Write an enzyme that holds these catalytic residues in place. Sequence first.
Site, PDB file in Angstrom:
ATOM      1  N   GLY A  19      -8.874  28.294  19.488  1.00 12.50           N
ATOM      2  CA  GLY A  19      -7.949  29.202  18.934  1.00 12.50           C
ATOM      3  C   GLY A  19      -8.343  30.462  19.197  1.00 12.50           C
ATOM      4  N   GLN A  20      -7.657  31.388  18.664  1.00 17.40           N
ATOM      5  CA  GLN A  20      -7.964  33.017  18.699  1.00 17.40           C
ATOM      6  C   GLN A  20      -8.939  33.279  17.737  1.00 17.40           C
ATOM      7  N   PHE A  21      -8.851  32.454  16.476  1.00 23.92           N
ATOM      8  CA  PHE A  21      -9.849  32.996  15.420  1.00 23.92           C
ATOM      9  C   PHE A  21     -10.927  32.186  15.605  1.00 23.92           C
ATOM     10  CE2 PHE A  21      -5.422  33.252  13.007  1.00 23.92           C
ATOM     11  CZ  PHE A  21      -5.401  34.826  13.035  1.00 23.92           C
ATOM     12  N   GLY A  22     -11.124  30.826  16.206  1.00 30.89           N
ATOM     13  CA  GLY A  22     -12.193  30.356  16.431  1.00 30.89           C
ATOM     14  C   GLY A  22     -12.030  28.789  16.697  1.00 30.89           C
ATOM     15  N   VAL A  24     -12.906  24.402  15.569  1.00 27.50           N
ATOM     16  CA  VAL A  24     -13.062  23.659  14.532  1.00 27.50           C
ATOM     17  C   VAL A  24     -13.857  22.069  15.128  1.00 27.50           C
ATOM     18  CG1 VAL A  24     -12.259  22.307  12.574  1.00 27.50           C
ATOM     19  CG2 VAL A  24     -10.953  24.250  13.540  1.00 27.50           C
ATOM     20  N   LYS A  38     -16.196  24.734  10.932  1.00 27.38           N
ATOM     21  CA  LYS A  38     -15.494  26.072  11.532  1.00 27.38           C
ATOM     22  C   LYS A  38     -15.997  27.179  12.080  1.00 27.38           C
ATOM     23  CE  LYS A  38     -11.424  27.040   9.079  1.00 27.38           C
ATOM     24  NZ  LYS A  38     -10.433  27.868   8.326  1.00 27.38           N
ATOM     25  N   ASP A 130       0.007  30.465   1.507  1.00 23.83           N
ATOM     26  CA  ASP A 130      -0.036  29.993   2.883  1.00 23.83           C
ATOM     27  C   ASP A 130       0.320  28.351   2.632  1.00 23.83           C
ATOM     28  OD1 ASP A 130       0.091  29.836   5.417  1.00 23.83           O
ATOM     29  OD2 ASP A 130      -2.093  30.497   5.962  1.00 23.83           O
TER      30      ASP A 130
END
Length: 257
Positions: A19-22, A24, A38, A130
Amino acid sequence: PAWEIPRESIKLVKKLGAGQFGEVWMGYYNNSTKVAVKTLKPGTMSVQAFLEEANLMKTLQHDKLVRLYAVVTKEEPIYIITEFMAKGSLLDFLKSDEGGKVLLPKLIDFSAQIAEGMAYIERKNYIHRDLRAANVLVSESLMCKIADFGLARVIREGAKFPIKWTAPEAINFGCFTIKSNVWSFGILLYEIVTYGKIPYPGRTNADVMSALSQGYRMPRMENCPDELYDIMKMCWKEKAEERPTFDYLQSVLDDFY
Protein backbone atom coordinates in the site's frame (compact mmCIF):
# COMPACT_ATOMS: atom_id res chain seq x y z
CA PRO A 1 12.76 0.43 25.76
CA ALA A 2 12.14 -3.23 26.41
CA TRP A 3 10.21 -3.16 23.17
CA GLU A 4 13.24 -2.90 20.98
CA ILE A 5 14.54 -6.14 19.48
CA PRO A 6 17.40 -6.59 16.98
CA ARG A 7 16.38 -6.97 13.32
CA GLU A 8 18.11 -10.39 13.21
CA SER A 9 15.57 -11.96 15.56
CA ILE A 10 12.86 -11.51 12.93
CA LYS A 11 12.45 -13.35 9.61
CA LEU A 12 9.98 -12.10 6.99
CA VAL A 13 8.51 -15.04 5.06
CA LYS A 14 5.27 -14.17 3.22
CA LYS A 15 3.97 -10.77 2.06
CA LEU A 16 0.35 -10.19 3.12
CA GLY A 17 -0.32 -6.83 1.43
CA ALA A 18 1.33 -3.55 0.44
CA GLY A 19 0.00 0.00 0.00
CA GLN A 20 0.87 3.68 0.30
CA PHE A 21 1.66 3.55 4.04
CA GLY A 22 3.76 0.37 3.75
CA GLU A 23 3.68 -3.43 3.87
CA VAL A 24 2.35 -6.18 6.16
CA TRP A 25 4.25 -9.49 6.51
CA MET A 26 3.99 -12.88 8.21
CA GLY A 27 7.18 -13.75 10.08
CA TYR A 28 8.83 -15.29 13.14
CA TYR A 29 10.54 -13.84 16.15
CA ASN A 30 13.29 -16.21 17.08
CA ASN A 31 11.86 -18.91 14.94
CA SER A 32 9.38 -20.03 17.60
CA THR A 33 6.58 -17.44 17.72
CA LYS A 34 4.51 -16.67 14.61
CA VAL A 35 4.23 -12.88 14.28
CA ALA A 36 2.94 -10.11 12.01
CA VAL A 37 5.38 -7.44 10.79
CA LYS A 38 4.13 -4.01 9.72
CA THR A 39 6.74 -2.36 7.51
CA LEU A 40 6.97 1.41 7.09
CA LYS A 41 7.65 2.46 3.51
CA PRO A 42 10.06 5.39 4.16
CA GLY A 43 9.10 8.94 3.19
CA THR A 44 5.36 8.28 3.55
CA MET A 45 4.77 8.88 7.27
CA SER A 46 7.11 10.17 9.94
CA VAL A 47 8.76 7.56 12.16
CA GLN A 48 7.12 9.09 15.26
CA ALA A 49 3.68 8.97 13.62
CA PHE A 50 4.09 5.41 12.35
CA LEU A 51 5.20 4.36 15.86
CA GLU A 52 2.31 6.17 17.61
CA GLU A 53 0.16 3.10 16.90
CA ALA A 54 2.64 0.81 18.68
CA ASN A 55 3.14 3.51 21.35
CA LEU A 56 -0.57 3.27 22.16
CA MET A 57 -0.50 -0.55 22.10
CA LYS A 58 2.01 -0.38 25.00
CA THR A 59 -0.81 0.88 27.24
CA LEU A 60 -3.83 -0.85 25.68
CA GLN A 61 -3.47 -4.58 26.39
CA HIS A 62 -6.44 -6.96 26.36
CA ASP A 63 -7.43 -10.33 24.86
CA LYS A 64 -9.75 -8.74 22.28
CA LEU A 65 -7.10 -6.23 21.16
CA VAL A 66 -4.14 -7.18 18.96
CA ARG A 67 -1.04 -7.27 21.15
CA LEU A 68 2.33 -5.65 20.43
CA TYR A 69 5.34 -7.94 20.84
CA ALA A 70 8.16 -5.55 19.90
CA VAL A 71 9.59 -2.99 17.42
CA VAL A 72 12.62 -2.54 15.15
CA THR A 73 13.44 1.18 15.09
CA LYS A 74 17.26 1.18 15.24
CA GLU A 75 17.74 1.25 11.44
CA GLU A 76 16.00 2.73 8.36
CA PRO A 77 13.33 0.06 7.65
CA ILE A 78 11.13 0.33 10.78
CA TYR A 79 9.04 -2.68 11.86
CA ILE A 80 6.01 -3.03 14.16
CA ILE A 81 5.76 -6.61 15.47
CA THR A 82 2.27 -7.76 16.58
CA GLU A 83 0.31 -10.99 17.17
CA PHE A 84 -0.47 -12.94 14.01
CA MET A 85 -4.09 -13.11 12.88
CA ALA A 86 -4.52 -15.97 10.45
CA LYS A 87 -7.81 -15.05 8.74
CA GLY A 88 -6.89 -11.41 8.02
CA SER A 89 -9.28 -8.53 8.57
CA LEU A 90 -12.91 -9.22 9.44
CA LEU A 91 -13.86 -7.45 6.18
CA ASP A 92 -11.69 -9.72 4.00
CA PHE A 93 -12.83 -12.79 5.92
CA LEU A 94 -16.58 -12.05 5.68
CA LYS A 95 -16.18 -11.50 1.92
CA SER A 96 -14.24 -14.75 1.38
CA ASP A 97 -15.90 -18.00 0.28
CA GLU A 98 -15.28 -19.45 3.75
CA GLY A 99 -16.70 -16.29 5.38
CA GLY A 100 -19.90 -16.35 3.32
CA LYS A 101 -20.63 -19.77 4.87
CA VAL A 102 -20.53 -18.48 8.47
CA LEU A 103 -24.10 -18.27 9.82
CA LEU A 104 -25.72 -15.75 12.18
CA PRO A 105 -24.73 -17.42 15.50
CA LYS A 106 -21.01 -16.74 14.89
CA LEU A 107 -21.74 -13.29 13.43
CA ILE A 108 -23.39 -12.26 16.73
CA ASP A 109 -20.37 -13.80 18.46
CA PHE A 110 -17.91 -11.79 16.29
CA SER A 111 -19.96 -8.72 17.14
CA ALA A 112 -20.04 -9.43 20.90
CA GLN A 113 -16.26 -9.98 20.97
CA ILE A 114 -15.60 -6.55 19.43
CA ALA A 115 -17.98 -4.94 21.94
CA GLU A 116 -15.87 -6.65 24.61
CA GLY A 117 -12.62 -5.12 23.31
CA MET A 118 -14.29 -1.71 23.05
CA ALA A 119 -15.64 -1.97 26.61
CA TYR A 120 -12.02 -2.24 27.75
CA ILE A 121 -11.00 0.80 25.68
CA GLU A 122 -13.81 2.88 27.19
CA ARG A 123 -13.06 1.59 30.71
CA LYS A 124 -9.45 2.67 30.11
CA ASN A 125 -10.90 6.12 29.16
CA TYR A 126 -9.64 5.88 25.56
CA ILE A 127 -11.27 6.35 22.14
CA HIS A 128 -10.47 4.46 18.92
CA ARG A 129 -12.08 6.75 16.27
CA ASP A 130 -11.45 4.27 13.43
CA LEU A 131 -13.71 1.36 14.37
CA ARG A 132 -14.70 -0.74 11.38
CA ALA A 133 -14.42 -4.29 10.02
CA ALA A 134 -11.18 -3.63 8.08
CA ASN A 135 -9.59 -2.66 11.41
CA VAL A 136 -10.69 -5.86 13.15
CA LEU A 137 -8.52 -8.94 12.68
CA VAL A 138 -9.60 -12.61 12.80
CA SER A 139 -7.45 -15.46 14.17
CA GLU A 140 -7.44 -19.15 13.15
CA SER A 141 -9.80 -20.08 16.01
CA LEU A 142 -12.05 -17.29 14.60
CA MET A 143 -11.37 -14.86 17.45
CA CYS A 144 -11.87 -11.15 16.77
CA LYS A 145 -9.38 -8.52 17.89
CA ILE A 146 -9.40 -4.77 17.35
CA ALA A 147 -6.31 -3.61 15.44
CA ASP A 148 -5.19 -0.26 13.90
CA PHE A 149 -4.85 2.14 16.83
CA GLY A 150 -3.43 4.83 14.53
CA LEU A 151 -6.33 7.19 15.30
CA ALA A 152 -6.79 6.12 18.94
CA ARG A 153 -6.44 8.89 21.56
CA VAL A 154 -6.82 9.44 25.30
CA ILE A 155 -9.93 11.56 26.01
CA ARG A 156 -3.54 13.08 13.71
CA GLU A 157 -0.46 13.28 11.49
CA GLY A 158 -1.83 11.90 8.39
CA ALA A 159 -4.74 9.47 8.42
CA LYS A 160 -8.35 10.43 7.77
CA PHE A 161 -11.38 9.49 9.86
CA PRO A 162 -13.62 6.92 8.17
CA ILE A 163 -16.46 9.25 7.15
CA LYS A 164 -19.05 6.52 6.57
CA TRP A 165 -18.38 5.16 10.13
CA THR A 166 -18.06 8.51 11.96
CA ALA A 167 -20.81 9.93 14.23
CA PRO A 168 -22.67 13.11 13.13
CA GLU A 169 -21.56 15.22 16.09
CA ALA A 170 -17.98 14.16 15.31
CA ILE A 171 -18.26 15.14 11.62
CA ASN A 172 -20.09 18.43 12.19
CA PHE A 173 -18.74 19.58 15.57
CA GLY A 174 -15.50 17.60 15.87
CA CYS A 175 -16.79 15.90 19.01
CA PHE A 176 -15.04 12.54 19.28
CA THR A 177 -16.08 10.59 22.39
CA ILE A 178 -16.65 6.96 23.33
CA LYS A 179 -20.25 7.50 22.18
CA SER A 180 -19.00 8.22 18.65
CA ASN A 181 -17.19 4.87 18.74
CA VAL A 182 -20.61 3.43 19.70
CA TRP A 183 -21.96 4.93 16.45
CA SER A 184 -19.06 3.39 14.48
CA PHE A 185 -19.86 0.06 16.16
CA GLY A 186 -23.43 0.25 14.81
CA ILE A 187 -22.07 0.61 11.28
CA LEU A 188 -19.69 -2.27 12.04
CA LEU A 189 -22.74 -4.44 12.86
CA TYR A 190 -24.07 -3.52 9.42
CA GLU A 191 -20.79 -4.80 7.84
CA ILE A 192 -21.03 -8.08 9.76
CA VAL A 193 -24.69 -8.82 8.98
CA THR A 194 -24.21 -8.01 5.26
CA TYR A 195 -20.87 -9.86 4.90
CA GLY A 196 -18.62 -6.84 4.28
CA LYS A 197 -20.85 -4.59 2.20
CA ILE A 198 -19.92 -0.90 2.11
CA PRO A 199 -22.03 1.47 4.25
CA TYR A 200 -24.55 3.61 2.36
CA PRO A 201 -24.36 1.78 -0.99
CA GLY A 202 -24.25 4.15 -3.97
CA ARG A 203 -23.61 7.19 -1.77
CA THR A 204 -20.45 9.27 -1.91
CA ASN A 205 -18.95 10.45 1.40
CA ALA A 206 -20.50 13.88 0.75
CA ASP A 207 -24.04 12.52 0.15
CA VAL A 208 -23.72 10.78 3.52
CA MET A 209 -22.62 13.72 5.72
CA SER A 210 -25.29 15.86 4.01
CA ALA A 211 -27.92 13.15 4.59
CA LEU A 212 -26.90 12.75 8.26
CA SER A 213 -27.53 16.46 8.79
CA GLN A 214 -31.07 15.70 7.54
CA GLY A 215 -31.34 12.72 9.93
CA TYR A 216 -30.80 9.73 7.65
CA ARG A 217 -30.29 6.17 8.90
CA MET A 218 -29.76 3.02 6.84
CA PRO A 219 -33.05 1.08 6.72
CA ARG A 220 -33.41 -2.46 8.12
CA MET A 221 -31.15 -4.58 5.96
CA GLU A 222 -32.18 -7.91 4.43
CA ASN A 223 -31.45 -11.00 6.58
CA CYS A 224 -31.13 -8.89 9.75
CA PRO A 225 -33.18 -9.90 12.85
CA ASP A 226 -35.52 -7.27 14.33
CA GLU A 227 -33.58 -7.40 17.61
CA LEU A 228 -30.21 -6.84 15.93
CA TYR A 229 -31.54 -3.86 13.98
CA ASP A 230 -32.74 -2.45 17.31
CA ILE A 231 -29.14 -2.77 18.53
CA MET A 232 -27.97 -0.70 15.53
CA LYS A 233 -30.72 1.90 15.96
CA MET A 234 -29.59 2.22 19.57
CA CYS A 235 -26.02 2.95 18.43
CA TRP A 236 -27.33 5.47 15.88
CA LYS A 237 -29.32 7.69 18.29
CA GLU A 238 -29.01 11.38 17.39
CA LYS A 239 -28.10 12.34 20.97
CA ALA A 240 -24.68 10.91 21.89
CA GLU A 241 -25.63 10.77 25.59
CA GLU A 242 -28.60 8.52 24.69
CA ARG A 243 -26.45 5.82 23.07
CA PRO A 244 -25.65 2.71 25.11
CA THR A 245 -22.35 1.83 26.80
CA PHE A 246 -20.07 -0.82 25.26
CA ASP A 247 -20.44 -2.78 28.51
CA TYR A 248 -24.18 -2.99 27.73
CA LEU A 249 -23.72 -3.94 24.05
CA GLN A 250 -21.42 -6.85 25.04
CA SER A 251 -24.03 -7.94 27.59
CA VAL A 252 -27.09 -7.86 25.29
CA LEU A 253 -25.27 -9.34 22.28
CA ASP A 254 -24.09 -12.31 24.35
CA ASP A 255 -27.65 -13.03 25.37
CA PHE A 256 -28.75 -13.81 21.83
CA TYR A 257 -28.26 -17.07 19.99
